[PDB]
Structure 1
Amino acid sequence: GTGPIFIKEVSNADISMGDVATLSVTVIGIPKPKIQWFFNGVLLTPSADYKFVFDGDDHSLIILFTKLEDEGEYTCMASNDYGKTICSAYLKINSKGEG
């Protein structure tokens, strides 16, 4: 019965606008921790262009069809009966446009 531990924390990433953005972690703990993702501190929910996927101990956030507005600080939080643990990364979206 241990708190959650990030074996693999999220990494910063640089993406061109429109490409797929991914953030990945590996987490362990008993009971199996639950994963949540935040953008500049606000909870993200699954939708057509955000996928919350997992496989075993691995979790990923997948952002399809990125727009400049998706640039910012993404936080992974893992939670179980014995604690809560976070890690964060910066997603930079290199964009082209006109005012």
Structure 2
Amino acid sequence: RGIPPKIEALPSDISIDEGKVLTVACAFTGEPTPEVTWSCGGRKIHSQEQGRFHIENTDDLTTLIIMDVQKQDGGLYTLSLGNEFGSDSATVNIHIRSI
């Protein structure tokens, strides 16, 4: 039963045009089910941050949704997982196109 968390695959780089909706989904494993943390700039992303960010988690999938994407939403995002038996982390670099 003591199995550390594992982030399955996550794109390294993704792009979205300003003003559109971005969705990035990522599967994971772990026993017990891990706590999920998304962050950018060393700051946790919260539900309805700026009235636009959302995080929908299930027991094996985490989905980050950014509505009405704005130029300041860019950067290197980290997904981290933790449980009693270990941790995992991976990054996706989110690029906002002004075009």
TM-score by length of 2: 0.88
Taking the aligned partners of 1:5 and 1:56, their CA distance within structure 2 comes to 13
Deviations 1:2-29 (A, max 9, x none): 1101122244211100111222211101
- Please identify, of 40-49 and 81-90, the stretch whose mean Cα deviation from structure 2 is larger: 40-49
Matched residues, number: 96
- For the 8 Å contact 1:11–1:23, the answer to whether it is kept is no
- In the other structure, the counterpart of 1:5 is 6
1:56 deviates by 4.0
Greater fraction strand:
2
When the two chains are superposed, the root-mean-square deviation of aligned CA atoms in Å is: 1.4
Change (3 A) 1:74 1:58: same
| Match status 1:33 vs 2:34 | yes
SS at the partner of 2:31?
A: coil
SS at the partner of 1:21?
A: strand
State, as a whole percentage, how many aligned pairs show the same letter.
Answer: 25
Change (3 A) 1:80 1:6: same
Unaligned runs of at least 5 residues, structure 2: none
- In the other structure, the counterpart of 1:21 is 22
| Match status 1:74 vs 2:68 | no
- In the other structure, the counterpart of 1:85 is 88
Deviations 1:46-68 (A, max 9, x none): 11311110244111110101111
